[PDB]
Amino acid sequence: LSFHRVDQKEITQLSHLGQGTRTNVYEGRLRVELRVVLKVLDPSHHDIALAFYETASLMSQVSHTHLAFVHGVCVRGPENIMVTEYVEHGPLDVWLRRERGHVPMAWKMVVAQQLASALSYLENKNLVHGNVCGRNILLARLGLAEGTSPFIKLSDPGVGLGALSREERVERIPWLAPECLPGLSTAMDKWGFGATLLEICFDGEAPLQSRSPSEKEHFYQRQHRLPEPSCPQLATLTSQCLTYEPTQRPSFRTILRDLTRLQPPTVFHKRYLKKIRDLGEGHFGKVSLYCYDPTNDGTGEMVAVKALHRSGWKQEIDILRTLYHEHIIKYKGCCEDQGEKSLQLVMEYVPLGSLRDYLPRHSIGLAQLLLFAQQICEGMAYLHSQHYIHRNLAARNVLLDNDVKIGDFGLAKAVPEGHEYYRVREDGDSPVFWYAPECLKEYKFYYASDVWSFGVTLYELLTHCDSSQSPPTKFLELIGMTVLRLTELLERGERLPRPDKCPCEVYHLMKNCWETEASFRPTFENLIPILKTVHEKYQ
Numbered sequence: 186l187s188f189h190r191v192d193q194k195e196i197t198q199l200s201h202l203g204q205g206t207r208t209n210v211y212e213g214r215l216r217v218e219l220r221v222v223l224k225v226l227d228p229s230h231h232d233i234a235l236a237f238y239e240t241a242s243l244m245s246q247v248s249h250t251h252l253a254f255v256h257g258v259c260v261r262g263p264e265n266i267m268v269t270e271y272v273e274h275g276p277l278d279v280w281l282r283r284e285r286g287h288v289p290m291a292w293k294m295v296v297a298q299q300l301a302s303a304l305s306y307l308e309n310k311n312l313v314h315g316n317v318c319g320r321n322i323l324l325a326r327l328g329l330a331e332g333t334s335p336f337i338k339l340s341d342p343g344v345g346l347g348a349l350s351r352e353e354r355v356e357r358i359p360w361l362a363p364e365c366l367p368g369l370s371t372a373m374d375k376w377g378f379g380a381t382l383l384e385i386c387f388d389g390e391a392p393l394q395s396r397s398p399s400e401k402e403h404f405y406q407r408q409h410r411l412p413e414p415s416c417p418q419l420a421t422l423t424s425q426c427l428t429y430e431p432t433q434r435p436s437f438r439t440i441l442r443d444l445t446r447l448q449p450p451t452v453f454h455k456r457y458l459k460k461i462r463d464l465g466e467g468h469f470g471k472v473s474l475y476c477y478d479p480t481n482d483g484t485g486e487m488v489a490v491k492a493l494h495r496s497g498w499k500q501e502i503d504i505l506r507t508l509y510h511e512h513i514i515k516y517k518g519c520c521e522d523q524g525e526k527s528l529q530l531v532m533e534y535v536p537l538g539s540l541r542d543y544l545p546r547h548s549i550g551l552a553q554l555l556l557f558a559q560q561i562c563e564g565m566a567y568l569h570s571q572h573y574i575h576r577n578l579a580a581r582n583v584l585l586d587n588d589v590k591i592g593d594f595g596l597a598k599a600v601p602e603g604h605e606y607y608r609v610r611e612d613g614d615s616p617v618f619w620y621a622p623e624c625l626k627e628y629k630f631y632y633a634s635d636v637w638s639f640g641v642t643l644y645e646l647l648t649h650c651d652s653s654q655s656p657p658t659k660f661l662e663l664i665g666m667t668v669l670r671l672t673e674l675l676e677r678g679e680r681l682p683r684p685d686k687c688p689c690e691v692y693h694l695m696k697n698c699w700e701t702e703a704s705f706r707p708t709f710e711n712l713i714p715i716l717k718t719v720h721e722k723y724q
């Protein structure tokens with residue numbers, strides 16, 4: 186379970202906006218200054234306080250243009266509070282009820298498309314929202330003015346569901362999937378979506394409004410079909426969505442297929458960038474989370490921006506521009522400081538962040554730890570094929586969205602085709618405890634040096650980045666100074682110990698990787714099959 190930690194001092198609570206199940210929503214401010222909303226959870230049952238925190242987790246590990254941003258969770262005495270993105274026009278059903286008779290079906294189709302896109306995203310990630318209703322859809326941009334179009338953000342689902350009472354599940358009918366009545370199918374969000382489309386078509390009026398909880402239950406028991414909307418093939422889409430048998434409900438790829446058919450660059454300006462938080466310090470500078478809102482309408486995208494010799498900084502940007510791979514951090518563009526002042530690197534925001542901070546948070550097993558390892562090799566083997574040495578492979582520089590992403594290209598160099606190794610004396614810091622004996626002793630960097638660097642990250646994966654059991658601390662226990670004592674240590678054959686509960690088979694690879702002679706080390710291409718075979722072992 187993962188979300189960012191928010192302090193009680195950072196938040197301020199404002200006007201009460203309304204109530205959700207077991208919650209009281211407030212406008213607020215985040216001192217990281219920032220307009221937010223505070224969903225406050227009433228002092229409640231553990232089973233439900235956890236299902237609230239489970240939601241914050243689902244939402245802190247996702248990144249989509251049509252999903253409302255979760256800043257983190259804060260504890261203000263007896264109450265659990267979640268800091269969410271404040272959206273200008275608020276709950277969609279409320280808005281539709283007030284805009285009754287001034288909303289075209291063209292406008293509703295854009296919304297339907299956007300919502301389906303946010304759920305198509307969740308579907309690919311095998312994640313379930315569970316509370317898709319117009320109240321949990323927020324209106325950022327109106328889209329009523331000529332030349333414009335609506336923009337929505339699907340908000341957090343609040344307390345889980347099923348964690349909730351049965352007579353509360355009955356109150357959520359017809360948004361509630363019928364299978365969910367006896368107290369998790371990804372098929373439940375295709376029922377909620379279809380029920381939401383009816384809510385949207387009927388301009389905020391809930392279908393089955395004038396029915397008692399007992400009357401609602403009867404409708405589901407007797408399986409009466411839900412009302413047909415306005416028109417056209419939307420009634421077809423709605424109907425398939427609203428099938429009591431979950432297996433018959435169409436996929437969000439098919440929903441978004443039907444919807445897209447029903448229809449009629451690298452320059453970032455500092456002005457449109459609005460900081461959220463800092464993300465970490467790397468080689469060359471700080472990475473900070475930004476929001477890039479060019480239209481100022483609160484519909485921008487979340488980017489990671491890195492700042493701050495100048496020549497070697499440019500090199501970081503030039504290398505990253507030319508790398509396209511599933512496990513390497515993605516280049517987006519550039520930002521110019523001031524009149525010649527400096528250049529800024531715009532990247533993709535990686536929801537779960539560095540492994541170094543993620544690992545001592547839920548002691549994840551061999552299946553997960555090894556999956557990461559094989560991927561770092563999948564990403565490193567591609568880097569090496571592009572004729573570059575990394576020189577900075579550590580767990581601090583390995584990011585993860587789900588469950589995966591290799592960053593910090595500050596030390597990466599290009600090896601000219603002919604040359605065996607690359608000489609670098611430095612004039613900066615270097616992760617010595619992740620460097621091979623030839624790197625420390627003679628300043629020589631072979632492709633083989635990154636493989637040494639790998640085995641060291643592989644160690645951290647298995648120590649769960651334990652600060653007491655870490656490459657700098659453990660290699661220093663062996664002494665009682667610099668790289669010189671380290672050089673002789675490794676030259677004797679002395680290695681980092683085996684982490685507790687590290688399968689001996691895994692610790693063999695680390696040893697293979699920590700070969701003194703660089704030419705005796707396995708290649709990154711050679712390690713992928715080896716890691717696949719082993720990853721198809723610890724289940």
Ligand SMILES: O=C(Nc1ccnc(NC(=O)C2CC2)c1)c1ccccc1Cl
Pocket residue numbers: 202203204205210222270271272273274275276320321323340
């Ligand atoms: O979704 C809610 N509120 C949100 C979330 C983010 N932004 C807003 N913005 C506004 O309400 C603006 C119109 C004033 C509301 C909300 C508010 C009260 C009660 C229950 C819920 Cl679920």
Ligand SMILES: O=C(Nc1ccnc(NC(=O)C2CC2)c1)c1ccccc1Cl
Pocket residue numbers: 464465466467468472489514532533534535536537538539581582583584591592593
């Ligand atoms: O790129 C870096 N960090 C990034 C980039 C994109 N997303 C994240 N995500 C987070 O930090 C999560 C916790 C919010 C980190 C970064 C920062 C310092 C050192 C090495 C790297 Cl690879």
